[PDB]
Amino acid sequence: DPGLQPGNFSADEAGAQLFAQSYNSSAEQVLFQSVAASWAHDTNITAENARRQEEAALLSQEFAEAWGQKAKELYEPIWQNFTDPQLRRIIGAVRTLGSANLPLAKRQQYNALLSNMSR
Ligand SMILES: *[C@@H]1O[C@H](CO[C@@H]2O[C@@H](C)[C@@H](O)[C@@H](O)[C@@H]2O)[C@@H](O[C@@H]2O[C@H](CO)[C@@H](O[C@@H]3O[C@H](CO)[C@@H](O)[C@H](O)[C@@H]3O)[C@H](O)[C@H]2NC(C)=O)[C@H](O)[C@H]1NC(C)=O
Numbered sequence: 001d002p003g004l005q006p007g008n009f010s011a012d013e014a015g016a017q018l019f020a021q022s023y024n025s026s027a028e029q030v031l032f033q034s035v036a037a038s039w040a041h042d043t044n045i046t047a048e049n050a051r052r053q054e055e056a057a058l059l060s061q062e063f064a065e066a067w068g069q070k071a072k073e074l075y076e077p078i079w080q081n082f083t084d085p086q087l088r089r090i091i092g093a094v095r096t097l098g099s100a101n102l103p104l105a106k107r108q109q110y111n112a113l114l115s116n117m118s119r
Pocket residue numbers: 109112113116
């Protein structure tokens with residue numbers, strides 16, 4: 001999907017600015033979809049809505065993971081100097097991939113551990 005997949009970009013301050021500018025164009029839509037599905041679940045508890053809620057949650061997680069991986073591979077060495085506070089905060093927020101840095105087996109074990117503790 002073009003929306004969930006970032007395009008080619010440049011590893012410079014101007015490239016970072018274009019990265020942040022393009023970040024809205026997909027993040028707005030993805031977050032609106034996910035949070036709207038969650039709101040529909042929380043207002044109409046019917047058994048249909050939970051499937052949409054979980055599908056949108058997975059979609060948002062994958063979008064964030066892909067964008068964060070691209071931002072990492074493009075700006076990790078140059079994550080210090082930007083001469084722009086707002087773009088620095090944006091890049092720091094996107095770069096933090098979190099639990100996606102684990103391999104497949106370890107990521108599955110981690111998600112299973114969280115779910116099992118909750119249960
Ligand atoms: C997450 O939880 C499941 C379910 O078991 C529950 O959690 C355990 C940690 C204990 O507190 C249980 O009392 C509780 O019911 C765990 O699966 C359990 O482990 C065994 C050995 O793995 C399961 O047999 C197989 O295990 C794997 C998947 O784990 C697959 O090959 C099979 O699908 C099959 O489930 C066993 O079925 C299951 N026990 C019960 C009573 O259902 C699971 O291991 C755990 N995951 C992690 C990462 O801790």
